[PDB]
Design a protein around this ligand. Structure first.
Ligand code: NA
Lengths: 306, 306
């Protein structure tokens, strides 16, 4: 029993973090095989960071300008490549702790674990949802760029996020491991705003299924809705529209509870319109939206064969 | 920026986690040097678990009865003994990944990270506080016993919790690494109840101070209270009574912010009675009590030298 936002175990990732210093700017890199991946603004001065021309800045850098440290071992940089907003530093040594891994680009409403690092050294780990406005509500201080987000499936680490920056509102923006930003953001110190965040509807529905399984079911009703009619109400209340892809991932919970997705949608719709009127769901007056259908099935209480 | 319930990186603990099987009963063990620590109820059949005489049940077990797997490597048990509620299985191979470590008994109110494991495979990591009633509100399913709780101090792992059971309320109970239960619980399937789960008042207050440093102080007011009249309200809401000693603990944060502890108490009193009115504090719509007075400032935003 018990619902907790858990991160995946971070060990396979810890053995890949290094420190990357380019002159008087430092951040973290990810060391896989003989390549170290890091945010390209490691080549900037603080002044450069206002309006960098990264191609012009990189021309002035040589392999010797990059100092890469794996604990107490210096790795010699033998080539470098800018790819979108990440730098790929080829080093003379393959990382012996390289896990089986892939790079994947995640979608809003999906979760991943963040390993926050400073100076190449892992600091803490926590679970994030990619918000519909393509920011994450992380915890990140100066020097944390190059920290990565990931999911783990058996032994295979799927890297999906590299941290780059913090917006004026205190939320966080980064790239996938190919170096393309999530969202409309750029790695310059300019006045950028993230769009209005919206509630991740599929995750609230998963939460509601979890509530039913644990016996909390006052909010169920006998009403019917089309998906388009439900989505019109969702958009009014700044909830994300439910897609067929969301309906697919709610399949197992629907099957195990016998509540069709569109019936649980009609139940949510009444919640949005009428509020919760002093009732609670799973012991809270607020609807959770960062437990995915996968999270819910993994942690939900289960039947007991007696 | 950002404020998150963060756990320590779990890599140093992942390398210690093994599966222990005795008959058809399996759970996790902690492999340090040539010893595996696990909950003693691995020797029970399910029917044994109701009212076990552990001494009698252990007498009928031999070394050969314990199967230990570290990944694909089988670890043969070459001695065994019981210590309170844990077993120490001596194995033929010292763990080459043993970190620097110690066993420590934490206090109610203190925090620790949990590496939840099943079949000796680490599954997830999250941060918990030892509740005033000596329970933990974690996410644990069948087969998670033997999962451990820990803090990391640079390179040294302080193991402080080993998981054993779930009470009828869904809350979790366990032991230190010498096998002594936190709280009055016993490792048998009986009708046990924990004491009242109170909110950790000193932790909420430290969090309010961290809020002020970050710039959330909409809850600050000009009112002040005495310790007694605060505790009147505290008991009404099942907050721990605030002692003068707790008041002393908050001295440093009080000096950091210029805010008298009893003035912060006045703000907390008003928040308890009137709620937050749709405002949040450090991104939370609830009063957070899982951050210790030392831990809270580490995530605060800092001054920027311009
Ligand atoms: Na600088």
């Amino acid at each position: 029993s018990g619902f907790r936002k858990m991160a995946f175990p971070s060990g396979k990732v810890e053995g890949c973090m290094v420190q990357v210093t380019c002159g008087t700017t430092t951040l973290n890199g990810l060391w896989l095989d003989d390549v170290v991946y890091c945010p390209r603004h490691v080549i900037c001065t603080s002044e450069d960071m206002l309006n960098p021309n990264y191609e012009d800045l990189l021309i002035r850098k040589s392999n010797h300008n990059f100092l890469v440290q794996a604990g107490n071992v210096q790795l010699r940089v033998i080539g470098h490549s800018m790819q979108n907003c990440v730098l790929k530093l080829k080093v003379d040594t393959a990382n012996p702790k390289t896990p089986k891994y892939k790079f994947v680009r995640i979608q809003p409403g999906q979760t991943f674990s963040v390993l926050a690092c400073y100076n190449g050294s892992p600091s803490g780990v926590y679970q994030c949802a990619m918000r519909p406005n393509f920011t994450i509500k992380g915890s990140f201080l100066n020097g944390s760029a190059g920290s990565v987000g990931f999911n783990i499936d058996y032994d295979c680490v799927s890297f999906c996020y590299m941290h780059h920056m913090e917006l004026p509102t205190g939320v966080h923006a980064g790239t996938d491991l190919e170096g393309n930003f999530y969202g409309p953001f750029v790695d310059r110190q300019t006045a950028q705003a993230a769009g209005t965040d919206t509630t991740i509807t599929v995750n609230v529905l998963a939460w509601l299924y979890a509530a039913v399984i644990n016996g909390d079911r006052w909010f169920l009703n006998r009403f019917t809705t089309t998906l388009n009619d439900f989505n019109l109400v969702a958009m009014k209340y700044n909830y994300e529209p439910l897609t067929q892809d969301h309906v697919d991932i709610l399949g197992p919970l629907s099957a195990q509870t016998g509540i069709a997705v569109l019936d649980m949608c009609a139940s949510l719709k009444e919640l949005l319109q009428n509020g919760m009127n002093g009732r609670t769901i799973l012991g809270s007056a607020l609807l959770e939206d960062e437990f995915t259908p996968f999270d819910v099935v993994r942690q939900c209480n289960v039947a007991t064969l007696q």
